[PDB]
Design a protein around this ligand. Structure first.
Ligand SMILES: *[C@@H]1O[C@H](CO)[C@@H](O[C@@H]2O[C@H](CO)[C@@H](O[C@@H]3O[C@H](CO)[C@@H](O)[C@H](O[C@H]4O[C@H](CO)[C@@H](O)[C@H](O)[C@@H]4O)[C@@H]3O)[C@H](O)[C@H]2NC(C)=O)[C@H](O)[C@H]1NC(C)=O
Ligand SMILES: *[C@@H]1O[C@H](CO)[C@@H](O[C@@H]2O[C@H](CO)[C@@H](O[C@@H]3O[C@H](CO)[C@@H](O)[C@H](O[C@H]4O[C@H](CO)[C@@H](O)[C@H](O)[C@@H]4O)[C@@H]3O)[C@H](O)[C@H]2NC(C)=O)[C@H](O)[C@H]1NC(C)=O
Ligand SMILES: *[C@@H]1O[C@H](CO)[C@@H](O[C@@H]2O[C@H](CO)[C@@H](O[C@@H]3O[C@H](CO)[C@@H](O)[C@H](O[C@H]4O[C@H](CO)[C@@H](O)[C@H](O)[C@@H]4O)[C@@H]3O)[C@H](O)[C@H]2NC(C)=O)[C@H](O)[C@H]1NC(C)=O
Ligand SMILES: *[C@@H]1O[C@H](CO)[C@@H](O[C@@H]2O[C@H](CO)[C@@H](O[C@@H]3O[C@H](CO)[C@@H](O)[C@H](O[C@H]4O[C@H](CO)[C@@H](O)[C@H](O)[C@@H]4O)[C@@H]3O)[C@H](O)[C@H]2NC(C)=O)[C@H](O)[C@H]1NC(C)=O
Ligand SMILES: CCC(CC)O[C@@H]1C=C(C(=O)O)C[C@H](N)[C@H]1NC(C)=O
Ligand SMILES: CCC(CC)O[C@@H]1C=C(C(=O)O)C[C@H](N)[C@H]1NC(C)=O
Ligand SMILES: CCC(CC)O[C@@H]1C=C(C(=O)O)C[C@H](N)[C@H]1NC(C)=O
Ligand SMILES: CCC(CC)O[C@@H]1C=C(C(=O)O)C[C@H](N)[C@H]1NC(C)=O
Ligand SMILES: *[C@@H]1O[C@H](CO)[C@@H](O)[C@H](O)[C@H]1NC(C)=O
Ligand SMILES: *[C@@H]1O[C@H](CO)[C@@H](O)[C@H](O)[C@H]1NC(C)=O
Ligand SMILES: *[C@@H]1O[C@H](CO)[C@@H](O)[C@H](O)[C@H]1NC(C)=O
Ligand SMILES: *[C@@H]1O[C@H](CO)[C@@H](O)[C@H](O)[C@H]1NC(C)=O
Ligand SMILES: [Ca+2]
Ligand SMILES: [Ca+2]
Ligand SMILES: [Ca+2]
Ligand SMILES: [Ca+2]
Lengths: 388, 388, 388, 388
């Protein structure tokens, strides 16, 4: 087995085609299924896996009550083959209320964060053993991507933040070889707040589109040089911005450099990627709520400040249905690297108060150079049929 | 691993022997089991798998209600080893309300269709990744085989239809290499309506026996030339016709070339295969309903128009029990290629209205050159014992 | 991978040590577990598997009602790793109300019998495909070992019977190469009735200890010559006889040649094996009921007619607990072939009428050259705690 | 594959980082999960497994009642990948109410003890087959480690005791090659009572830290010479003693040689390991009950009698939560051998009498050379939510 280099061109895509759906919540009404949130997808060279953070309980279980909370000691990272729902034979890979995972061509790295808010621990598990750990550097919820990390030539990189969720924080980029931290670079450039990065290989480097939780409804960009560990950062140029909340399309702005100060506080994990001067991106359909999900290409979305000409829109989840986090993953093809994404479909509290739990299912799409139609692939559970 | 060529003679069979049964519905009354329909079987070079289209729910689950409907966004293709019932650890391979799968000797291809009736998307997934997609060409339920596709020397073929279910439609034959569509041929020949083809390798080509939903109770044939991509089509010669509905045996006809215009509208997926001038075929025992299942050889059934002399009949499911779809799969032996088939055993609505769901189990038989006796292997669930 | 020859001496044993227990019935009271009977064990070169005939239902399921019956179309052969209870992810290997399985060093052979009592079909499945089948030869419940067959140098042998259960029947010994029947030898010698053989390799041949259901409470022996397909048969010499029912030890007899005509009608599947002039054997503790289970060595039990000197007795299941069928399996060690056995622990009807089902768990012991103590390892379920 | 030698230096650790948690009890309230106790962890060269002794029943099951008892014939050793909770697909590896398991680099050895208190049997199962057995030598609960054994160059060693739990007993150290007992050494040295050893490779030998159930709240040490089979024993020097019960830190003593006669009777399985003159150890936080769990380094804890200066304390489970047994396992890294440990988190009787069962979950930590924070990772089940 050889290390991945991702040294192929990006697949030229026309949009996205359906790839996977797990129907977790519908199944939870007639089966023992894990309560989860913060899902993601990552693939080894042969096949894909779905990950999520468990809440230490199944849904039809009194312990599902009040699982809206983000951090308890019982949260563990779950890992199954993509499309295998989180049933009771699911492996809990590590203890984690925040995580990232990636395969370097030889083995899986898992970055697992747990413990006290003011003094958390990140464990680095590689090829089935604990190789390293780091403690909190700002004593304020050490946290990471909630999606796949990226490895080139046996060096994996992951973005982590510690500090305020509503003000300047301390973001660092780790470089990890076979589970061992070999270098840590501080964030540099013009991005002013970084959360929950969605990163992808862009050989010879790695590029991340993240969440600004402080002053931006435009999404920050972090560029990671894998050769010298140098970091740059900025914001997605597109005037059609990717965060939630955000302004209406007619009054939203980005200048590529600064947070836009437009409903900037709070946010949601999301993704985008560049193709030359253009941008492919997803976002919730609602400007204020985690409802619906759409993708489109923005002409000049990568290179032209405040560009708003979109094309090739697809509805993934219609706006009468709940969405959630979304993130990118990359899949090596015969001659190119494809970009895929997942959407977290959050059900229960706080939006749906008939039930006392909070959980999610997922839907997953992959880039295509072919053609496609239309649809909507929401969670699909009837809240009135659920155990409360 | 090398590509399959299927370049062995067809096994000379005397009939069929019992191979597998999953007891899905019986188990669903005391366990968490997927609601399914449109099952099939396909084998890699070592072992066989059962497939079906899930309805995004287990049976003992309020979401099972009104699963008689064919197309919802929560339908996914399920895949287990043959004989492993669809329990909660079952992998959902893709999103699909119509599908076909096949192994080319190196990896699995899945053809998965989902989305809006008037604008569906077919995804092509090979070796664990999305390689291609195509959109609806006639804006009227793009759809495919619901049984295995067939690959020779790395090229897989699958038959797809888009358009009216009760009139002239637009049928196309796709040729796919490692998940990439390399050629598309329109239907040609004398078949006037094609649905749900049951295809098999007949080196150097592929032969399909399908469903005419418009004017024929005789089954159409599609012949696929894998060298030059040319297509031919006709109808099975046998005067003992394979569709349901159909006329009784004394008043049924086929001329090998045209739909017979005998209770032609509607149909059921089924199969047959040639052996020289003769034909092995299955059909429902009832001429009007999806009840019972029988196989037999028709002497001159392939070559002689309106041939009605049968021999080697076997009852698979007696006529007091529900059947459903059936399809062929092929299994490479040491010196010959064997033909096998599955029968979908549909329980629930519309035939059984005590319950609100519709689901199925399967029974599976394989060609034998040996001897055998008699029996009947129906679904076996007591409708009165089931969750409603 | 090479064919097994079993060409090592038999391990010299001092008795038997505990090996496995599945606790099936206890688990069935809080879990979805298959209803079964007629279990057995067989091992490939690396590890062991438990087999049993399912009843097409779980225990906590209304379909478990009246599963005392031996033959229904829904019975399938289940196969798990030894000690994995028959949960809903269990693979149903074939359709069978009577079976035998064995691994030839390269792949699994399964012999699966199903269909009508007067016209059954035996399917021969090898390396995941149906290779052969045979129909009933006496039109009266074609049936086989309910324990492992035995293969030497790629030829597997299995004993089958068709005809009366209470009078002269037609017993045949099949020789099978990669699933294909290559020879069938009729029973020969002095054994007058043969059921449910427990066979083991005794290089260069195979030896079986079976059940006489007609005139003998002494167990018949069948010796199979794998070189020329010739058959011999006789009865176990031991005056301590192995069948149930049987006479008291003080009035039981065997002359090694004929059925003893001592409570000869009916019986139970069991086993024994030779070591020089001596015999290792198991039997129920009760003379009339399938209750308890004991093993011991009979001095001169193989060579001396009517020998009754036993030594090295062990209680496996005390006589306040239900037993059932038992059978031998053989396991290749570094320098010798070991003999192991399983005991079926039948619960429910007809003996326990609080519940309407009949099922079983298993316990498994292996020969040892070491030392051991005492115990009792019954099913362990409280009938009053069970779903009815 | 080659035999393990463990011939690398011990990793130099700063403390421990979170590795795994199974949430067994929380899940048992909404799923079918085994009742267990006496868990441990052991890894083959690629991955780690969790083990425990089942009670022949799931928790939500009337058979869970009165599972506080230590020895019934239905107890079996369960084995899953680490983090896969004990669901119904879990393999029962052998029959055992006391056990030890270890991988020698080529295959797994399991030591499984069951049967009558006064005449137990230990079975030795290697590479999937029973290779040896030994009977009770003192007729008083033959018993072993309840954690991993240790193998060097194909010879595995395990510590076993037979005799009084409250007085002089008969402890022996076994040496096992491919499942065959090749030598047995009696305990020698100054340890006066040995139970439940937690052993680890310390090339060229094996070192064990155990439980004195008679006169010591200081933990005994057993040193095993793998070259000549000689045995030495003593007590851990640390004045901060590891057993429960024990005196408070201001009045506890150890002289490295004798049991301290300080609340010596009874105990709990635990662990410690040397690093030069210092000692890493865990213990319950409570000095009288199995409540809480803490680790720390004792400066001079290995070499200096009655040393009480600690550093690098970590809370693993706070003292408001139940703990239980704990044990060490070792994991080979690239350049060093790491030490890890598990903590059994006992729920139910006798401490929690709302329910009638006794079961456990686990939490697992591994040595780290990096940094870490703080937390508490208790079982987490609400006793009021549980089936009784
Ligand atoms: C069948 O499916 C195909 C493929 O999905 C679909 O074609 C697509 O239609 C959409 C909508 O017209 C196209 O995307 C648009 O492109 C134009 C630029 O040409 C943009 O102006 C659009 O943006 C706006 O309008 C949106 C609502 O449609 C607003 O949400 C947005 O804020 C802008 O105002 C949009 O991006 C897309 O390019 C095609 N795709 C292709 C490959 O042609 C077709 O319409 C479907 N037909 C039916 C009957 O369902
Ligand atoms: C034990 O099992 C064997 C194998 O299954 C069985 O032998 C089979 O019997 C059937 C029925 O007789 C044979 O099939 C028939 O063949 C004749 C030609 O010889 C056909 O005319 C028959 O067709 C019609 O009759 C059917 C009703 O049986 C109608 O459904 C149909 O519309 C026609 O009118 C039919 O195909 C078959 O060939 C044999 N198979 C072999 C290998 O011999 C045997 O009968 C069973 N034993 C007992 C006692 O029943
Ligand atoms: C601890 O365990 C050991 C090993 O299991 C056990 O030793 C065994 O005891 C039995 C019973 O005494 C021995 O088997 C007997 O052997 C004599 C010949 O020496 C036979 O006569 C016995 O047969 C009869 O008695 C039986 C009842 O015991 C009747 O059922 C039977 O019909 C005959 O009348 C019987 O076969 C066995 O040989 C030893 N095994 C060894 C290896 O020594 C020991 O007794 C146990 N001790 C305790 C206190 O539990
Ligand atoms: C964030 O997490 C870090 C790492 O866990 C943590 O640092 C650790 O703090 C503990 C507690 O101070 C240190 O352990 C102590 O070391 C001193 C020697 O310097 C010992 O005297 C202590 O022993 C006693 O005190 C204990 C109570 O704390 C008693 O239980 C005990 O009986 C003794 O009386 C104890 O071992 C540990 O060394 C550091 N670890 C490192 C690597 O620095 C830090 O405190 C956390 N941050 C915050 C704000 O709490
Ligand atoms: C801790 C601040 C962080 C980014 C604002 O909040 C996240 C937001 C979440 C959210 O907005 O839904 C849920 C995440 N599980 C949470 N992360 C953690 C580690 O608790
Ligand atoms: C759309 C026409 C097509 C063939 C007549 O209908 C099928 C018939 C079915 C049927 O006759 O039972 C069920 C199939 N699930 C359905 N296929 C789709 C894709 O919905
Ligand atoms: C059919 C006669 C045969 C031997 C007497 O009866 C067996 C006895 C049984 C028994 O005595 O318990 C159960 C077996 N499942 C049955 N075998 C079959 C094939 O039905
Ligand atoms: C028999 C003495 C022994 C060590 C003191 O008791 C153990 C203590 C236990 C305990 O203190 O919790 C539980 C163990 N399951 C038990 N071991 C056996 C084999 O029954
Ligand atoms: C969930 O917990 C809350 C707070 O204790 C309680 O009011 C509510 O009844 C619980 N819900 C259920 C369904 O038990
Ligand atoms: C299924 O849905 C129908 C329509 O809403 C309803 O009348 C019926 O009661 C439902 N069935 C069950 C079992 O709840
Ligand atoms: C089992 O079936 C019998 C016969 O119909 C019936 O009398 C009995 O009530 C059934 N048992 C249960 C538990 O439903
Ligand atoms: C457990 O057993 C005891 C003793 O028989 C009994 O009193 C108690 O009710 C049982 N518990 C349950 C939950 O049935
Ligand atoms: Ca924001
Ligand atoms: Ca028709
Ligand atoms: Ca008899
Ligand atoms: Ca003590």
């Amino acid at each position: 087995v050889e290390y991945r280099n991702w040294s192929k061109p990006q697949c030229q895509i026309t949009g996205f085609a359906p790839f996977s759906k797990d129907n977790s919540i519908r199944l939870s009404a007639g089966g023992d299924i894990w309560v989860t949130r913060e899902p993601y997808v990552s693939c080894d060279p042969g096949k894909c896996y779905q990950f999520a953070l468990g809440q230490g309980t199944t849904l039809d279980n009194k312990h599902s009550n009040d699982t809206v909370h983000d951090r308890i000691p019982h949260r563990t990272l779950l890992m199954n083959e993509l499309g295998v729902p989180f049933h009771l034979g699911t492996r809990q890979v590590c203890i984690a209320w925040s995580s990232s995972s990636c395969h370097d061509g030889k083995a899986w790295l898992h970055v697992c964060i747990t413990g006290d808010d003011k003094n958390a621990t990140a464990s680095f598990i590689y090829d089935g053993r604990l190789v390293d750990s780091i403690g909190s550097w700002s004593q304020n919820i050490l946290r990471t991507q909630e999606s796949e990390c990226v490895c080139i030539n046996g060096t994996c990189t992951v973005v982590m933040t510690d500090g305020s969720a509503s003000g300047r924080a301390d973001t660092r980029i780790l470089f990890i070889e076979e589970g061992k931290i070999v270098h840590i670079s501080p964030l540099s450039g013009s991005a002013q707040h970084i959360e929950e990065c969605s990163c992808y290989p862009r050989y010879p480097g790695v590029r991340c589109i993240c969440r600004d939780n402080w002053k931006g409804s435009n999404r920050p960009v972090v560029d990671i040089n894998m050769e010298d560990y140098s970091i740059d950062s900025s914001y997605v140029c597109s005037g059609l911005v990717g965060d939630t909340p955000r302004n209406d399309d007619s009054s939203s702005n980005s200048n590529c450099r600064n947070p836009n100060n437009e409903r900037g506080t709070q946010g949601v994990k999301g993704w985008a990627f560049d193709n030359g001067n253009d941008l492919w991106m997803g976002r919730t359909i609602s400007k204020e709520s985690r409802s619906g999900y759409e993708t489109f290409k923005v002409i000049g979305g990568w290179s032209t400040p405040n560009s708003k000409s979109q094309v090739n829109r697809q509805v993934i989840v219609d706006n009468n249905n709940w969405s959630g986090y979304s993130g990118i993953f990359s899949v090596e093809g015969k001659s190119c690297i494809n970009r895929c994404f997942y959407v977290e479909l959050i059900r229960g509290r706080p939006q749906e108060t008939r039930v006392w739990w909070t959980s999610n299912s997922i839907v997953v799409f992959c880039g295509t150079s072919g053609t496609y139609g239309t649809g909507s692939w929401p969670d699909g559970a009837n809240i009135n049929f659920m155990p409360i």
